[PDB]
Structures are given as structure tokens and as C-alpha cells.
Amino acid sequence: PPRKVLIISAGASHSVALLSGDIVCSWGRGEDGQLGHGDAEDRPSPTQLSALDGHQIVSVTCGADHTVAYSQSGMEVYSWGWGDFGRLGHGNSSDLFTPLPIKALHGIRIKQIACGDSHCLAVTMEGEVQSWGRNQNGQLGLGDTEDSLVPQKIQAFEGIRIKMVAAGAEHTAAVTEDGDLYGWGWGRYGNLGLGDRTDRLVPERVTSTGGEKMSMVACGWRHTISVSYSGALYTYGWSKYGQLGHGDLEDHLIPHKLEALSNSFISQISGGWRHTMALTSDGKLYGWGWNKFGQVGVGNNLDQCSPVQVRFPDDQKVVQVSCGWRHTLAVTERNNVFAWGRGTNGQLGIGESVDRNFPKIIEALSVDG
Amino acid sequence: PPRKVLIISAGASHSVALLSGDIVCSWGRGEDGQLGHGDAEDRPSPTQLSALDGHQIVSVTCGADHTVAYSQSGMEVYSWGWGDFGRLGHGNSSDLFTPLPIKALHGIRIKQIACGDSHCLAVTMEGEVQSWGRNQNGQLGLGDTEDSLVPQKIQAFEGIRIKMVAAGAEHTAAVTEDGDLYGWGWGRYGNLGLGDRTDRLVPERVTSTGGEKMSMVACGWRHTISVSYSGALYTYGWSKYGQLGHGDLEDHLIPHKLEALSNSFISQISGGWRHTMALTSDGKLYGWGWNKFGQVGVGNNLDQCSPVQVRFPDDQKVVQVSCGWRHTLAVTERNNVFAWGRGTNGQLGIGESVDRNFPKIIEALSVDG
Ligand SMILES: [Mg+2]
Ligand SMILES: [Mg+2]
């Protein structure tokens, strides 16, 4: 049976994928150790992370300049990349150019991991949450502003099963199994959804959600995206570059329904640095926001303040999407992988290349060419 | 005659110089606009910044991912590069890929400008200080934690003539004409020099100074360096990488005299990301700290927790030095410019190049070859 991409994830300037046979590979900027190959060099094409061969990795997640992965059979979480503020979770600030197990998480059943710029969160199968890394604005949700070099349990969520979490530059969001939405950390651009511009040191519930329950949440750098049980899309926080998608540049301090997508059901969402992607249940991908380097994928370099459909060869349906800072990655129904946007660190994975403003196929990972 | 190099300055991944005839050149990483040529591409060789031709620039200063320059006769300060948190001072958060005047400083007599990661300060000829940018940890010295997109006067220095200022990642330091030393902002690694690990929102005087008045101060990312009236060197703050230079890896919460240099008179100092440089009055350059990419300049890749002399062809004396995050620049008495360390963004200025662990001449800017 042919090799397939199972998971993709984009960081600020790098890209990581998990392939069938439990193979991790990475490409793009390598200077901070984020690719995990032991050296500090950029890789313009997908490169196998040999140190994780045989570790039965089942998922990968990129932060800005670090990467995390976990194995079910090994009951192990691994991290690598820039080490400052404890974002790697090992009880020190050392960078890592090769994956190491986060000892504190050994033997814990992992449901999901989220990574921001300088902090990370892990959700367990029992719906508990542990966090680590930078905490200067309360983003760990632990009630103070002191960085944590190791994972700590968020006590605020005792008795509250968390479904998924998300992390931006210096903020955090979560949805519960029963559909409640929370935000905490740096809040100056309205990105917590709480109706003001003030930080929170512990999770606070978002009360104005259209009377709707939320099924998922994602964070861009200073904006936040959520989807309701009815598949309606909400965005809040910073819209300097139109990344909220409402057809203007206004900030929102509470979740605001993106009306232009109301006749679609949103199945996946991703927040980039200054851009946004949303995938419909019919496999149509929509992008908006900052487009200087073509990362919106619509064949130009003009910013887009309303969602525009990203087009693929033969109209093949999209199934996964992940936003980096200046680039975007996607996987289609045909098991093809596409990249677009900034390419100077090799993050597009298409060998040496100029920037691209519409989707370009990654031959190394695709069935087509 | 090749133009005399008057000033050099290094940023995180870029380099800038001012030449005689008032021309500015920049090289290195261009992605955030920090080079100022209008485009976003890296430049591996010194490239003349045409937009400043004829503007009578007398000084240039790099922050991590932005650049500032000012003209005495024009009475203008210019800035360009990454715009987030207001580090450029224009009353908005926009990046600039070409220099623009900071209107708020027009007509003001500038004595000195310092740039950190996300905040900047200017000292006026009258000894007043204005600051702008990120303020999450009080680094603007304005008494609060709200970012400022325009310059604001530091009222705490009313009646206190300031001689020079310096800025690190998220902290700030200053020395007065009378020899007093101050620190403020993010203080978690002891880098304010105040005997603790807590932040300050306004400037606070350092009271443990070895009984000495201070004439100079510089900041690395999370460490701080000062020079006394007798030419003694003091360092404080973070020493994970030996950047304090005391022959161990211990943090210091108050200024600590670097005894190994006690027989020399220090005339210039520079702090890098995880390394440090000091120049003596007889032109000998010493480096120490993190040396992964060869940025200490001593011909190897061993970290150095004590000062080691950086050697130059024919033992030519050094007159200027500037530390980047992963590289270092220097100018010699013969008006040659040398670079060493990381070169992947072109920051060494010597054409496409591998990293270098000892000084390499920049032929474009140098008398010799
Ligand atoms: Mg290139
Ligand atoms: Mg290269």
C-alpha cells in the first residue's frame, strides 16, 4: 500500500509531516533546532527525522520555532527546537536540535497538544490540561505570571472535561466537551473574546457566543477562531490585516459570526500569523488576511479582508490545512500535499524556490506531480 | 579611496553600516524589512540604502528585526523593519520596508538611540529620554504595562541628566552624567542589577556598583554590562552560556566586577544574544559566551565563560565592535571591517558563505583584502 501523509503542521518558518509507517519528516528553517535533524540548517525539501524512526509517533504539532510529537504505544511526548522560557518542557531553557522525551508526560494518555510561540498545552484523554513555557501574561492559566519550565496541571479545569485547546503568540483558548468556550493570557487586541482588552491569568468563560455551543477553536498570533455545533464560524481579536474576515479591518472583543460563510459548514480551521484558513465539509478551502507573500493562495499578493476560495488542480477536495507565519500547507482527498506563500527558508518543501501565491504540489509527498 | 566606515551595528540577523559621504549600507536578513531596500530579500553583501542618500545620516542602530538612523542637520530620526508593538514609533503597527521619519521626534536634538527586541529609546542633547514600543514588562519606564506606538517622555528622569541608554530583549538600562546606573523592565534573570528577579515599571537606581560611578552601559538579550570611571568592567544578569564572563555559568543579581580584565581599561562594550564583547583602550578585543556558530571569534566552537582575545591579521587594533544574535562585527584602526559567526542570512557581508569562527574581512567595505 502506497505511502500517505497523515498529519501536516506548519510553524513560523518550518513544516512537519507524519507519513504512513510512522515516519516523521520536516523542512524549512532549521536555525533553532525546530526540524530536529541535529544540525541547524534549512531544508528546502522533506527530510526524514530518523531519530524518531521506530517510536510510533501518531501526531506532530508545530509552535513558532519548536515542534512537539507524541506516541501512544510509547506513552511518550517529545519536543525539540528553541528552548527559551521552557517551551520544550524539560525543566531547563536549553535548545534541542534532536527530539527528547518530556519526562513529566511519560505514561499519560494524550488527546491533543497545542503549541503557541513560547508556551504549550497538552489535553489528556480524561479531559485534563497541563501547560508549560512562557507565562508573563498568564497564558499558562495557572493564576500567576511566572514561566514554567515543566508541565503543570491547570487546576481551574477540575471537574470540567476539556475537548480541545489552542495557543497563539501569548494567549490560549479552549472548548469543553459540553461546548463552553474559554480564553486566557495576553488580551490586548480583544483576542480572548471577553469583551475587553485585559489579560487573564486563569481561564475565563466566553459568555457571548450567540447562544451557541462551540465544537472547536484555533488561534492565530493575535486572533482567535471558533466553530459552533451548527458549523458557523466565529472570529475575534486583531483584524489589522483583515484576518477576522468580516470584509473590513475592525477588531472584535467578543466572537463575531462570519456571515459570508453562513451557508457552509466549517469542518477545520487554522490561524496563521496574520492570515486565516477555514475548510468546509464539502472540501472547499477558504483563506483570508495578510497576503504579502502569497500565503492566502488566491493567485495574487493583495490582502483579503473577506474569505476567498483557494483553488486546486481539477477542483480536488481539501481535507487538511495548516497555517504558518508566512506560508500555508494543505492535504487533499487524492493524498496530494500542497504548499504556498513564502519559500525563502525552504518551508514550501518544493526544493529551491521563489515564493508562490497559489497552491504548489509537493512532489516528495504526493501521488501526483 | 574606499569610504571610511564610521559606524557599524548588528541586529539579530542583519548588519548596517554608515560610511563617509553619509551613505548607509545594510546586509543580512531582509524578511521583515530591516534592510530598507523596499523588497524583502536577504542580502549577502553590503547594499547601499538608496532611500537615505543625501539625508545626512550621522548614526545607525539595529534592534533585533528593525533599524533606526538619525540625521543631526536634518533633525530627523528614521526607522524601518518589523512594526509590531510600535517599535518603529509611527503611531501604528505597520512594518516598513523603506525608512520613514518618526514625526514625533522631528526637530529634536538627538544624543543617542538604543534599540532592543521590541522597544527603543532616544536620549536628547539636554539629557531627557523618550521611549516607545512594547511595554508588557515595564521596559518603557513609563510606569505601566501598556505598549506605546509613539515616543513618550520618561518623566522619572526629570532633573536627572542621562548620558546613555541601552536595551535588551525586554529590559532597559541607563547611566547618568553623574555616574548613576539604572535598570527597568523584565527582571527575571537578575539583569536589572537590583538584587532580585522582579520587574520594574519605572527606572530604579542600582545601588551596588562596587563603590564606583559608571560611564557606559550595554545590554545583551538578558544580561547587562557596565564600565566604571576607572575602566573596570561589570556584568550582571543571565549566565546560562557564560555571557557574564566570570569563569562559571552563574547568574548575578547585582553588578559583578569581571576580575580577569582588571588590568585593562575598557573603552567599548557590546552585548549579544548569548555572547559579549569588550574592547580595551589599547585596541584589544575580548569576546566570551555562546560560541555554537563561532560568534566569539576565537577560531573554534567551544563556549567561553571567560574573556578570550579575538585576533586579527597583523595584530591590527580594533576601534569598534557590535554583537548580533549569532554574529559579531568589528572595525579596525586600518579601516577594515570584519565579521564572524553565523552567515546563513548573509549577515557576514562576504557573499554567500558558510559560518565562520574567526574574523573574516568584508572586502566591499575594507581598505585591505
Ligand atoms: Mg535565499
Ligand atoms: Mg542557505
Bridge partners of A8, per DSSP, are A17
Asked if B42's CB is within 8 angstroms of A344's CB, the reply is: yes
d(CA B1, CA A288): 52
Which residues of A, range 145-184, sit inside 8 Å of B by Cβ?
Answer: 147
- Given a contact cutoff of 8 angstroms between Cβ atoms, the answer to whether B221 and B274 are in contact is yes
Q: Cα dist. A299→A114, A356, B2 in Å?
A: 30, 8, 45
Phi-psi region of A38 (alpha: psi -120 to 50; beta: other; left: phi over 0): left
Cβ-Cβ contacts under 8 Å, A293 against chain B: 40
Asked if B186's CB is within 8 angstroms of A93's CB, the reply is: no
Asked if A147's CB is within 8 angstroms of B40's CB, the reply is: no
Q: How many helices (H) and strands (E) does chain B have?
A: 0, 28
d(CA B12, CA B34): 10
Residue B22: what residue type? D
Q: At a CB cut-off of 8 Å and minimum separation 6, what does A344 contact? A: A355, B31, B41, B42
Cell, residue A359? 497552491
Q: Report the candidate in A115, A273, A128, A149 with the shortest Cα–Cα distance to residue A203.
A: A128
Closest ligand to residue A44's CA = 2
Count of beta carbons in the 10 Å neighbourhood of residue A95: 18
Q: B35 CA to chain A: closest CA distance, Å?
A: 16
Q: A342 CA to chain B: closest CA distance, Å?
A: 10
d(CA B18, CA B24): 5
Which residues of B, range 206-245, sit inside 8 Å of A by Cβ?
Answer: 240
Coil, strand or helix: which one is A271?
strand
d(CA B317, CA B257): 25
**Best mutation target, B344, B347, B355, B357, to test chain A (most A CBs within 10 A):** B344
Domains of chain A listed by start with CATH number: 1-369 (2.130.10.30)
Closest ligand to residue A352's CA = 1
Residue B46: what residue type? P
Q: Report the candidate in B233, B207, B215 with the shortest Cα–Cα distance to residue B179.
A: B215
R_g of chain A computed on alpha carbons: 19
Cell, residue A173? 483558548
Which residue of chain B is at minimal alpha-carbon distance from A31?
B344
Q: At a CB cut-off of 8 Å and minimum separation 6, what does A31 contact? A: A40, A41, A42, B326, B342, B344
Which residue of chain B is at minimal alpha-carbon distance from A30?
B344
Side-chain half-sphere exposure of A159, counting CA atoms within 13 A: 1
Q: B180 CA to chain A: closest CA distance, Å?
A: 29
Q: A43 CA to chain B: closest CA distance, Å?
A: 12
Which residue of chain A is at minimal alpha-carbon distance from B147?
A188
Which residues of A, range 59-118, sit inside 8 Å of B by Cβ?
Answer: 93
Asked if B136's CB is within 8 angstroms of A31's CB, the reply is: no
R_g of chain B computed on alpha carbons: 19
Q: Cα dist. B197→A60, A212, A230, B251 in Å?
A: 35, 44, 49, 11
Asked if B137's CB is within 8 angstroms of A93's CB, the reply is: no
Cβ-Cβ contacts under 8 Å, A292 against chain B: 40
Full DSSP string of B313-333: GGGPPEEEEEE-SSEEEEEET
Asked if B344's CB is within 8 angstroms of A42's CB, the reply is: yes
| Alpha-carbon dihedral sign for residues B125, B126, B132, B138 | positive
∠ Cα A312 A316 A318 (to 5°): 85
Cell, residue B6? 564610521
Asked if A344's CB is within 8 angstroms of B41's CB, the reply is: yes
For residue A202, with 0-12 CB atoms within 10 Å meaning exposed, 13-18 middle and 19 or more buried, which class applies? middle
Q: Cα dist. B160→A12, A179, B129, B153, B311 in Å?
A: 43, 57, 10, 13, 40
Bridge partners of B112, per DSSP, are B123
Distance A22 CA to ligand 2 centre (A): 29
Q: Does A137 touch chain B (CB under 8 A)?
A: yes
Which residue of chain A is at minimal alpha-carbon distance from B293?
A40
Q: How many helices (H) and strands (E) does chain A have?
A: 0, 28
d(CA A180, CA B291): 49
Helix H, strand E, coil C: the string for B85-106 is HHCCCCCCCCCEEEEEECHHHC
Closest ligand to residue A29's CA = 2
Find the Cα–Cα–Cα–Cα dihedral B142, B176, B190, B131, rounded to 10°: 30
Residue A317 DSSP class:
P
Phi-psi region of A292 (alpha: psi -120 to 50; beta: other; left: phi over 0): alpha
Q: Report the candidate in B208, B118, B35 with the shortest Cα–Cα distance to residue A169.
A: B118
Name which of A41, A137, A240 is nearest B136 (Cβ-Cβ).
Answer: A137
Side-chain half-sphere exposure of A150, counting CA atoms within 13 A: 6
Which residue of chain A is at minimal alpha-carbon distance from B31?
A344
d(CA B52, CA B31): 20
| Alpha-carbon dihedral sign for residues B345, B349, B350, B354 | negative
Residue A357: what residue type? N
Residue B311 DSSP class:
P
Phi-psi region of B23 (alpha: psi -120 to 50; beta: other; left: phi over 0): beta
d(CA B341, CA B328): 6
Q: Report the candidate in B91, B141, B79 with the shortest Cα–Cα distance to residue B115.
A: B79
Coil, strand or helix: which one is A200?
strand
Cβ-Cβ contacts under 8 Å, B342 against chain A: 31
Asked if A136's CB is within 8 angstroms of B137's CB, the reply is: yes
